[PDB]
Design a protein around this ligand. Structure first.
Ligand SMILES: [Ca+2]
Ligand SMILES: [Ca+2]
Lengths: 443, 82, 82
């Protein structure tokens, strides 16, 4: 759910993290397709090592910054994510042998802890929205979550979905409204953990109904997230995920006074084999692995199977795991875990300057290259130039490039699907129509 | 691959039969929606004639972007017709 | 008051020929016809169930509920159907 929420903040980030955690070799195919750039992106992995003596001198960040051109790697004692203003360094390089180069080469409105927003507990009836009330309300750039549930459906635990969206470094105006569309009984069963949260609304109905999806203003939503809680009851391969596929296909086909295909949607699949039904314009081979598929590469599909690789990585570097809990679900300080252990209910406390200081933690975001100071660099064709200029000017650390599928093709195309490329080389072709994954401090 | 074996691409039409006598009509309709989604995914242009145990499931399958009733697609709803 | 025989087919049974019994079995044959003539299926949906036009199908797809509106000359015009 944290990966899903981060993908909501920056589309295709769940694919980025999953490919970082999985161990993949370098593969090159001769025929020119998006798959070459994707496979170059997936080859990079997450690693950790101690910094050398050269980087422990006059100041840490200034020596750490801009040195990535000579090191040919990228850096991410405490957990540090894009720092600003013998200590571990988290590297995104490809193969651990070459990663061993930095060391060798010396030449009340918030919550009590202050991590998440908070508000007074609310009744379920207060946040229930009817079709008319949802229609009149202005919802734009918001989050809509379709939930398939019954009386016998198990608890999804949507709390882990809502915490990462409302972090302290997000201003109350910058928040994205969350609307859960689905059966009222199941949502009520999970509402008790949810009533302490702000900007949450509930709409009874079903995501298969086009009227409900029109009422919640899908055409302008920032993300639509499809979940089914009944996967544990149903065992047959065919019976699994039919509701999710139908909801995705109905959202794609829905037409507005434009086509619904351009709508960003993420679907959770328990069975990888169903992934072929998600995109109509995709070649389907059952032998093809889930990460190679177009819906996963574009970030529209997520499955928990990839998370299995975590069990390996978590063993080799314990720190890595906690960094994930920092990159998703906001921050996970031990005091917060202690309060969850004691109470299990999030509680809000009166603000103090210490809590307000604990907001410098960066957050993931999309940067548009068409409009902005980096427009000239867009057509230049050097990613490393963009990397160096961004680091020098705004100290913004860019994970990678979220790129149109058919941009490499000479003939213009109407496709809107974009795939992620992780840590592109310095000599990487750049086009103006690209997105940049970045970490930004509080403002 | 099995669709490549029976040559869906050159096939003029595809007919999906339904088990009218089933414990859960929604389950059979759902199996049929899997069939239709798979066949359209491999090939959207091909005609499909299918039996429909429930009328609202006909609405669900109408929501498919590949489904195009005007040209050559037909849905036979058993409950509606009876 | 009829001669019963399990070998006799349903179309030959006395209560079916009298129009007092119905079953979905006969509707199966529709598939064959629906393959050879697409338009004939439309005629069926016109002869029974009244007139379900593309517009009504679109409205039901969008809403799944019937809606009533104020009469206009065009709405009263399309009444010629036998
Ligand atoms: Ca590698
Ligand atoms: Ca496909």
């Amino acid at each position: 759910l944290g990966f899903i929420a981060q993908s909501c903040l920056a589309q295709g980030l769940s694919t980025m993290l999953a490919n970082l955690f999985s161990m993949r070799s370098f593969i090159k195919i001769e025929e020119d397709t998006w798959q070459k750039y994707y496979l170059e992106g997936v080859s990079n992995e997450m690693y950790t090592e101690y910094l050398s003596s050269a980087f422990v001198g006059l100041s840490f960040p200034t020596v750490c910054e801009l040195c990535f051109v000579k090191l040919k790697l990228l850096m991410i004692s405490r957990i540090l994510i894009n720092p600003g203003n013998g200590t571990l360094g988290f590297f995104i390089a490809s193969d651990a042998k070459e990663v061993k180069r930095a060391f060798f080469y010396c030449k009340k409105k918030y919550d009590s802890t202050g991590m998440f927003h908070w508000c007074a507990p609310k009744e379920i009836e207060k946040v229930i929205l009817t079709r008319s009330e949802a229609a009149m309300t202005v919802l734009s750039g918001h989050v809509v979550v379709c939930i398939f549930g019954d009386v016998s459906s198990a608890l999804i635990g949507l709390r882990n979905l809502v915490m990462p969206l409302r972090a302290s470094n997000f201003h109350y105006h910058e928040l994205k409204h969350i609307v859960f569309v689905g059966s009222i009984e199941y949502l009520k069963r999970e509402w008790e953990t949810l009533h302490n949260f702000p900007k949450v609304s509930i709409l009874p109905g079903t995501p298969l109904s086009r009227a409900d999806l029109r009422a919640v203003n899908i055409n302008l939503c920032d993300m639509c997230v499809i979940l089914s809680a009944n996967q544990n009851n149903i065992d047959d391969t065919s019976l699994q995920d039919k509701e999710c596929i139908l909801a995705s296909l109905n959202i794609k086909s829905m037409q507005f006074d434009t086509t619904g295909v351009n709508i960003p949607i993420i679907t959770e699949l328990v069975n990888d084999t169903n992934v072929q039904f998600l995109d109509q314009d995709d070649d389907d081979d059952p032998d093809t692995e889930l990460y190679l598929t177009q819906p996963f590469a574009c970030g529209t599909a997520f499955a928990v199977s990839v998370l299995d690789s975590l069990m390996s990585a978590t063993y080799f570097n314990d720190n890595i795991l906690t960094l994930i809990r920092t990159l998703v679900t906001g921050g996970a300080t031990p005091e917060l875990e202690a309060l969850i252990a004691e109470e299990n209910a999030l509680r809000g406390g009166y603000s103090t300057p210490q809590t307000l200081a604990n907001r410098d933690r960066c957050r993931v975001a999309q940067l548009a290259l068409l409009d902005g100071p980096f427009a000239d660099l867009g057509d230049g064709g050097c990613y490393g130039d963009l990397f160096c200029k961004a680091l020098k000017t705004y100290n913004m650390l860019c994970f990678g490039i979220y790129r149109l599928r058919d941009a490499h093709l000479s003939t213009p195309s109407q496709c809107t699907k974009r795939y992620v490329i992780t840590n592109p080389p310095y000599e990487f072709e750049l086009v103006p129509t690209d997105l940049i994954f970045c970490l930004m401090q509080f403002d | 691959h099995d669709l490549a074996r029976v040559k869906i691409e050159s096939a003029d039409a595809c007919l999906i039969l339904a088990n009218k006598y089933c414990a859960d009509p929604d389950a059979e309709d759902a199996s049929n929606i899997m069939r239709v989604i798979s066949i359209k995914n491999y090939h959207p242009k091909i005609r499909i004639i299918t039996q429909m145990l429930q009328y609202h499931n006909k609405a669900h399958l109408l929501n498919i972007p590949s489904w195009n009733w005007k040209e050559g697609d037909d849905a036979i709803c058993l409950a509606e017709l009876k």
